[PDB]
Design a protein around this nucleic acid. Sequence first.
DNA 1: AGGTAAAACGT
DNA 2: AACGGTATTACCT
Length: 201
Amino acid sequence: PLAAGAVILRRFAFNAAEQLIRDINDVASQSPFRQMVTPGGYTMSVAMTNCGHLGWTTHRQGYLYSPIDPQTNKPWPAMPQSFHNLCQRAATAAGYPDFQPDACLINRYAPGAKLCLHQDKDLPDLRAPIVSVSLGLPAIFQFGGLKRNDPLKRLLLEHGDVVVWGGESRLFYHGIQPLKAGFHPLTIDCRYNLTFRQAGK
DNA sequence: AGGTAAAACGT
DNA sequence: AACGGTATTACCT
Ligand SMILES: O=C(O)CCC(=O)C(=O)O
Ligand SMILES: [Mn+2]
């Protein structure tokens, strides 16, 4: 195990990946990738979009799961069936058979892009896991503990890898180190990540 | 009283 | 470049 309640399913999504990427492109044709601006005024290096009922976003006052894309003023695209099916299968393999996600944050990393150590914090009256799917170029994933200075595990995540955490590890600090440039036959020059959560009801 | 920003420069 | 300061506060509910 990666941690209590956490596991990495290596290449779990490899067979599903071509279809997942087609569906990323479809989602992004409606809610485009955008680099969000933090409350403090800095533009994130990762470009993001969302699908499902709820999408993660920043704005002046903090972070928010929102049912509407603040850029388009339309609902986020519905969660693709390919995404939902893959998520369900991975969650079940990881020991979370009852997971019902309603939120998928899609990350796009260009060379140099990073995601500094953070926690995916608890949502009110909800304790569902996180399912996190890697596509395209490889990245170094940091996975720590409850405190920022708890020692980090560093794990290369390659195309098709799925990481799941929850329960005792649900609030662990994690992140991505600056992406190395490279080639991948399906994504060409980037890495995508899918982050599934239950954020509503 | 407690949660959230920093999911973002210096050594 | 891996580690850690910063929020050691300010501003909300
Ligand atoms: O890209 C990854 O593997 C992790 C992404 C992540 O932590 C997030 O979007 O919250
Ligand atoms: Mn995260």
